[PDB]
Design a protein around this nucleic acid. Sequence first.
RNA 1: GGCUCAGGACAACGGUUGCACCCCCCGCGGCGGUCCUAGCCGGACACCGCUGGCAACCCGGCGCCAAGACGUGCGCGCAAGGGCGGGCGCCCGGGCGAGCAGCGUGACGCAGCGACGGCCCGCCCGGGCUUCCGGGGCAUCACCCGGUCGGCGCGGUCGCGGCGCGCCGAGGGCCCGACGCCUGGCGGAGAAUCAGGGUUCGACUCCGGAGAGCGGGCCUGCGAGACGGCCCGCACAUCCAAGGACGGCAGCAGGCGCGGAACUUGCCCAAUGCGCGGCGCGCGAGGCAGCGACGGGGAGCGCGCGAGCGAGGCGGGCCCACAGCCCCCGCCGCGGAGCCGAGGGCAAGCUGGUGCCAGCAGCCGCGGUAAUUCCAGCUCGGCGAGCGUCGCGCG
Lengths: 258, 201, 167
Amino acid sequence: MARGVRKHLKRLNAPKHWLLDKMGGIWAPRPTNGPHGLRECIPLILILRNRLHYANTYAETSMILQDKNVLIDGKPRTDPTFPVGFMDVFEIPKVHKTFRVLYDVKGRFTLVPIQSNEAGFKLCRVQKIFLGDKGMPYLSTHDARTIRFPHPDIKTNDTIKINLKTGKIDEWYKFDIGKIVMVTGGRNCGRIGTIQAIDKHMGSYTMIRMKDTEGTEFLTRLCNVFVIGNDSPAVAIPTTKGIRPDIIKNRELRLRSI
Amino acid sequence: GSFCKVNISNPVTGANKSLMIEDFRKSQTIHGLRMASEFDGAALGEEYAGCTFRITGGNDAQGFPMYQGVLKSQRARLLLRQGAKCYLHRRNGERKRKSIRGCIVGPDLHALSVVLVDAGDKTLPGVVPKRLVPKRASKIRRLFKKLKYPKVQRVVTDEKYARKQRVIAEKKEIMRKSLQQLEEYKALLSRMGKQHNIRIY
Amino acid sequence: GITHDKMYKRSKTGAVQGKWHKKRKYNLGRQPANTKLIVNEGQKISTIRCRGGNIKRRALRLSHGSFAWGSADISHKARILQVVYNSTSNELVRTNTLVKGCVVQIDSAPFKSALSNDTLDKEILDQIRGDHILARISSRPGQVGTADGYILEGPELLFYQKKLAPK
RNA sequence: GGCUCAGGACAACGGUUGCACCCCCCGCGGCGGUCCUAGCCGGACACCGCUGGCAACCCGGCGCCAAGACGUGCGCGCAAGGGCGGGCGCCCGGGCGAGCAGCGUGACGCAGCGACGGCCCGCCCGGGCUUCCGGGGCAUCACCCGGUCGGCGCGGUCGCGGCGCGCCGAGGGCCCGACGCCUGGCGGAGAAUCAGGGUUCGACUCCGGAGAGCGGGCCUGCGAGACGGCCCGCACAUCCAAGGACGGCAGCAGGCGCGGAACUUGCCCAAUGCGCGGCGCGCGAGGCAGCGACGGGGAGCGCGCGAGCGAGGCGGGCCCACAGCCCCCGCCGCGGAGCCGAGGGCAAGCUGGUGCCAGCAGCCGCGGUAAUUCCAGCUCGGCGAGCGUCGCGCG
Ligand SMILES: [Mg+2]
Ligand SMILES: [Mg+2]
Ligand SMILES: [Mg+2]
Ligand SMILES: [Mg+2]
Ligand SMILES: [Mg+2]
Ligand SMILES: [Mg+2]
Ligand SMILES: [Mg+2]
Ligand SMILES: [Mg+2]
């Protein structure tokens, strides 16, 4: 029974969707606390070193971050272990590359290059409405951001559009049947579909049923259902519109690419 | 050995000196005296008569220091806390048990620390030079190769004033914006109840 | 030292359980404050550094407290005279020890200073005309450093009056 | 972080719940109204100078000086706790499955922040306890428990709770195996074996738990009942200029003892990470090398009538924190097989000795003049850089 909090992370005990190599080393980076937690995030160095290949070692990534060449929602971050999460903005001005962090059909993080018209905001999921000091209403989001004095019409599990420049709401999407959603956890991560039923069980989890555009149907709990607009997506999405292929189709694709 | 290394320090002029004693009959008057106890120098007729001394400390034969409030003529062990005399800590909250000689004076001593408080007219081999000068602004204001001088402190130049004014203005505008936001939210909610702490006064 | 761990107890069947670890600081305890009514003298309160840096204060001696008359909504600060009843033990009463639930006598001066004539609860007015008023303690000394309460009335007043009348 | 498995058998542990009984540093985002010299307040110590004790370990006295240290504190009422504020059969917003939060008002109390402004709130990781199921053997252990079971009240705790105390009543568990005793008992993910069903093990790589000679206690700190932190008893151990002082390798190497059994008292932070930080430092974590027939994988001691090819040696590259090693380019050139057995199970037979002796033989059996079985030579068989013997597990 450890006397205090943990600071290390063994490579084998790291999350699977990070795709770390077994023999790369004994250790893995331990993300620091921030907007996203350990199991729904990814350290900055992994993106800067094992994905874009701009750096070959820890020291290069540290130097780059100190030089303040990377922006995360308009605020330069110098922490090599800063956690990056879903619906983030990842812009590198010195190479005119701007990406949005999303989930692929396989259930992994991806960078979707975006335009300037939609790179000044982000979508947030509201999880809690509480009264703070002096009875002032508040709200919290999945990225650990608190807003004061919100519109009464906003309820839990809704989606919020906040401008990055200032940090103010402009519009919100209600949680209802017939609204396009994206799955952010479980066996169905990265899929896109439309809500068709909402079944609530007293004292336990609420289940959400959605249908894929092709006609497929799948189930998931409400804790990882993310509205990304009405009917049509508000933001850009990867090339494939959240359609998971079968093993046979994936094998055909692999053989074609070989 | 059988002696006592009496060290004399003059605080008015910052001069100190030491000498040796080879007897106890002479120091019998010194016996039974505690710290901060007046001891007339007439015991030492060698240019010390008529001068009032004060006992400040000393080291026993083995070298153990002397502690004020024990009230004893032999050494004893106690658990010493942080910031106490005769103990150097290593960890922040660590203690130690070590021996110390008693406050009361006796023949077992080997070194005696004494100070001069009042003397006669006669001057003795035992001016105060100042290797350093005051560094705070208030101190110097009260009091009055290379050129090396201390850097002054507690001086309020131009940029300190600007910083304080900026901070005050920032706090004021923060309060004003919060008040405005509360007012507009209150103007809204015309069709619902509300529960906030009303500012008093 | 003092612990509230369940590892030193028997099981529901009466068996003895084995000791599989040493003592832990999560499960510690401390000696009671035993707050004493005053009746080098003065109010004394101590501070305790609890887990997480939080601060807890236990009163060792006190003499005053705030008491509220709910029916008429009259609250004043009064002096406690002495303890007269306790549902746990007579020894606490003899020693004049203050705990939550103690029944005490407070001075009537603050409450007779006004509304001694207004037609309120008759059973309280007679007490007001005297010198002491029966009251109860609602706070927890030893945790917050205060001894507050309320003036009795209703069935509980009759209960305690019958309890302490024959004595 | 690293080491180990002593203790512990409705416990630890694995999966599944909950806190409307809880605490939480860094980090991220908010928030920021403080009752009654502010061109900027006050005093100290550290290092250091002078002077000294003591074998060592340790410290003493006097003396000017600094703060993002300490203390006081300018400021638009604000910490904790306490009294009162909903219903008339039930159900049909800040928020819930759930009367939970916040607020108003009457009394107390002036906590925290403030000499370059942060008290407070939310998330996050982590912890504490908690629901349901699983969780070794012995019946030459059949009845067991007496804070043991429940209720009331207080105290203590971060917090619920017989957690502790006082009073009251009596209960709780058991052949669907209690209680007691034993274990050469850490648990799981997993490993060995092999038609299917199963049996045995599970110190060791990942997770969780416990410990730092035995037994206890405690300070600092958000966080420790910490041991490369302190105090005590016990058992060991070291220096002594005899009055005194002082230690904890189940961390890396190394040594003794024990045993059937187990490696260098090496180099480096260059890679993976952690700590503190701007152009880096440190890390016996970790990496590199050395010993290494535990063990696993790939080639060879020739082919053919002449050539060719390795091992090996000498130089140049590449690699390397530096050195190796692999691989590549030139010149010269060592080709080396053992361990078991030949009566049967079980594939493989002729001479010379010995004479129920010496010896072989897992079992059957041989040996007392041809010994197909002992001891030797020849020949032959199996596996092969490996073969055989002893113990354990599966079959
Ligand atoms: Mg004030
Ligand atoms: Mg200060
Ligand atoms: Mg054991
Ligand atoms: Mg472990
Ligand atoms: Mg431990
Ligand atoms: Mg310890
Ligand atoms: Mg340690
Ligand atoms: Mg050690």
